[PDB]
């Protein structure tokens, strides 16, 4: 089993944000499983591993681009297939950063729901 925490980042401000601005921290712990796979879940996933996607603001409907940070992606142990579906895997008992993807984004003041699916993997 996995103990999963997803923690939103404090002090985010509307307007032009820094490239790769951190917006949430994923924390996955386990006493029994060595690795986990993770995918973003939304109405518009934009890559073949589910590690970048778009999310809509609750009050405005404006979209922002979100995903695992470049540093987090470089920490992946592997990309494995679960009945043909790609999941990038990472060490359990570790944290990953969810960020605003790509070049600087101009973010409208709003609340943006971020949803992830995490699954245990034994390598």
């Amino acid at each position: 089993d996995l103990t999963v925490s997803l923690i939103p980042v404090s002090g985010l401000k509307a307007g032009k944000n820094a490239p790769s601005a951190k917006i949430a921290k994923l924390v996955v712990n386990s006493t029994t499983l060595k690795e986990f796979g993770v995918r973003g879940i939304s109405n518009n996933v934009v890559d073949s591993t589910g590690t970048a996607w778009r999310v809509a603001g609750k009050n405005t409907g404006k979209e922002i681009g979100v995903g695992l940070s470049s540093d987090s992606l470089r920490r992946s142990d592997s990309t494995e297939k679960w009945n043909g579906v790609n999941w990038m895997t990472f060490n359990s008992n570790d944290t990953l950063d969810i960020v605003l993807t790509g070049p600087a984004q101009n973010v409208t003041a709003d609340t943006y729901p971020i949803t992830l699916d995490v699954v245990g993997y034994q390598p």
Binding site: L2, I7, A24, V107, A109, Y112, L116, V118, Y121, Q122
Partner: peptide, 19 residues
């Protein structure tokens, strides 16, 4: 290697950008 289907979880949080 193998995935453990019973361990799959969905987690959600809100990122709030303020003026």
């Amino acid at each position: 290697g193998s995935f453990l289907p019973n361990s799959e979880q969905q987690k959600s949080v809100d990122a709030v950008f303020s003026s």
